[PDB]
Amino acid sequence: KIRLYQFLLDLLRSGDMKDSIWWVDKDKGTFQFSSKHKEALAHRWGIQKGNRKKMTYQKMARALRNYGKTGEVKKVKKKLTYQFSGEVLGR
DNA sequence: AATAAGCGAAGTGGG
DNA sequence: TCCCACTTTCGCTTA
């Protein structure tokens, strides 16, 4: 089963939901969600995972918070903005 | 108030 | 057994 950070990285690379997520500075690995269209992306995550309940952005962002310690994704101090680690990016 | 972003014990998967 | 990698529930804080 795909990991959340890889799901997001693949979307950014493919461009398939450009109205829900986008690079801010791709060289730095910073990206941002759409305030109005992020829920459609969260829904896609839950369906790809086969989860029992409908996925929400709040539940997806909670999983993102859990990467804070191990470092794969860090929250940036700008609205709806995150940053991948160089390690995640280099793969 | 209404809305939104952000934060942090127990259940489910698949090892 | 007991960790993985989240998921789900529920409530709180700030703007």
Q: Which helix (H) or strand (E) holds A9?
A: helix A4-14
- Write the CB contacts of A87 (distance below 8 Å, at least 6 apart in sequence): A71, A72
Nucleotides in chain C near protein beta carbons (<7 Å) = 5-11
State how many domains chain A has.
1
**Residue–nucleotide distance: A19 CA to C2 C1' (Å):** 41
The parent domain of residue A47 ranges over 1-91
Strand C lies under 7 A from the Cβ of residue A35: no
Structural contact between residues A82 and A75, judged by C-beta atoms closer than 8 angstroms: yes
| Separation CA A22–CA A36 (nearest Å) | 13
Closest to A72 (Cα-Cα) out of A60, A61, A64, A84:
A84
Chain center to CA of A68: 13
**Method underlying the structure:** X-ray
The angstrom resolution of this structure is: 1.8
What is the DSSP annotation of A49-81? HT-SSPP-HHHHHHHHHHHHHH-SEEE-SSTTE
Residue with tokens 């940053």: A83
